[PDB]
Structures are given as C-alpha cells and as structure tokens.
Design a protein around this ligand. Structure first.
Ligand SMILES: O=C(O)c1cccc2ccoc12
Ligand SMILES: O=C(O)c1cccc2ccoc12
Lengths: 151, 150
C-alpha cells in the first residue's frame, strides 16, 4: 500500500538511529538523534511527509503513539498514526533483520566516516540502491507511488 | 533529465537554508545549517542521493564546486558535479522566485514552529504538495518512474 510507513528505532554507539521504512518497497530514510523523544520523532515525521506521500505511520512504541508532539505533527502533515503492533508476526522479524543489515553496512563503511551520522546515510544509500529486475527499494517505491498516481 | 538537481543556498534569520531542487519537477529537499561549508554541503548531498537517484548536481557556487569534501561526497555517491552557471538565464529567475516563495511560506507558518528548522520543513511540505494539475511530488515520481521503464 503506497502511503504506509513503519517507524523503527535502533541503537548503536550509545546513540539512536530512527528509521522510517516504506513497508511495500523496503525503501528507508534514517537519522541519528541523541535520543528518541517525541520532539525528535515529530520532526523526523514532518521531514518524511514533506518528501513522500505519507498516509499512515505505524509508530514504533507506545510513548511515540501517545506523545502529543508526535500527534501534532501527524495532524499537521495529514498522517494517520497507528500502533505498530505486529498482528502479523513475520513483520517483527523483517524489521529486526533490516536493523541487523543496516548495522552491518554501517560497520562496512564506518571507517570512511568520521561521524556516525555520515555512516548511517551511507548505509541508507547502499540499502536503497541495492538490487534485490531485480529492482532496488528506490525503484520499487517510485513504481508503487507512480502506479498509485494513475487512479 | 530525471537525475538533474540544482543546489541553492538562501539566508533567513541569520541562518542558512540549503535547498536541492529537482529541476524537471520543482520538487525540493531543504535543511537549515549554521553556515554553508563544504562539510555541510557534502553531508546534504549524501542524504539526498540516498533518497533520490541523483545523477548530476549543479552546484550553487564556486566554493562548493571546488570543495574537496563536496567532491568526495559526489565521488562516493556517484554524482557528477557541474557548475550552476545560468546557461539558459531563465534558470536563474526560477531559483530567485522559488527562494521568495519559500520565504513567504516560511513566514506564513513561522508562528506555528518554535525553530526555524520546523518552519523550513513545513515549507518543504507545502511546496512539494501544492497542485499547479499535478504537484512537484507527483511530477518527480512520474518522471523517474517513466525513466525506470526503458
Ligand atoms: O533508482 C531509482 O530510480 C530511485 C528512485 C527513488 C529513490 C531512490 C534512492 C536510490 O535510487 C532511487
Ligand atoms: O503525492 C505524491 O505522490 C508524492 C510523491 C513523491 C513525493 C511527494 C512529496 C509529497 O507528495 C509526494
């Protein structure tokens, strides 16, 4: 479904990496923050929704589901906030594996980057460009949404 | 072409807004930074090229064109760096008008945001969703989707 994203928060080097995954394509955006607060999560979702047509977000935990700053940004940006409960459980494993994959890439580039934030963005780039066509996630998200626009 | 972006740096509230415009669609990504440096520009290009299929960037000035750090990020991300000289001169007035438009949006949301960086991101959202009949966000997806199919 073209508008559905999942939030995912993972830890590395005593810092937090906030990830949004476009569930249908596997495409991601990510940022490093010093910790997951509502204010950070709200800003991150605002950035995401100005860049892709975000209709539904599965939030990553109940604090962010509850957070009034996150609810304000979802209201502002037109995003329906949902809980992120894996009523389908293969769903949990998909995210865990991506966190493992991302950290692996971060490790592979870590020495090319002075700051963790550069390595995370190199990781976003390699993730989004990897051919799986085969098509990449970046190709899949564009195809999904462009098919959707023809409606 | 689907892969061509232009960098654009504008100032407001004694801060700098770095903008990348996807030239064919008008779609933008922007960030606030304390000053335009090679390091900031390099990191911004790295983020953009992980998000969209960036093939050529028209750099905004000669310092960023020259910058070793920007050249390094362009190398890493597979981006051809080009100067941004207005070869067709209508190019130029297009950017100035966009900067004026953005700043207008920023003023209209400014009071809903405590920090300039929130207002800038609200402005990117309004800019990219505005219908002109398709929005810039729809145009960039259609352009690149058409591209992928060949
Ligand atoms: O390869 C593509 O067409 C593509 C489309 C949209 C986003 C990204 C990020 C890396 O590649 C892409
Ligand atoms: O509306 C769309 O399909 C769309 C596609 C790609 C990006 C953006 C940003 C807001 O809207 C979009």
């Amino acid at each position: 479904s073209p508008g559905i994203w999942q939030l995912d928060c993972t830890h590395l080097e005593g810092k937090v990496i906030l990830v949004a995954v476009h569930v249908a394509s596997g495409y991601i955006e990510a940022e490093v923050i010093p910790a997951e607060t509502g204010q950070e999560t709200a800003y991150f979702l605002l950035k995401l929704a100005g860049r892709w047509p975000v209709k539904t977000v599965h939030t990553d935990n109940g604090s962010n589901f509850t957070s009034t700053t996150v609810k304000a940004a979802c209201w502002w940006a037109g995003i329906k906030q949902e809980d992120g409960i894996p009523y389908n459980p293969q769903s949990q494993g998909v995210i865990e594996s991506m966190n493992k994959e991302l950290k692996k890439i971060i490790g592979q580039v870590r020495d090319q980057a002075e700051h963790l934030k550069t390595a995370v963005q190199m990781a976003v780039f390699i993730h989004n460009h990897k051919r799986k066509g085969g098509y990449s996630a970046g190709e899949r998200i564009v195809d999904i949404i462009a098919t959707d626009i023809q409606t």
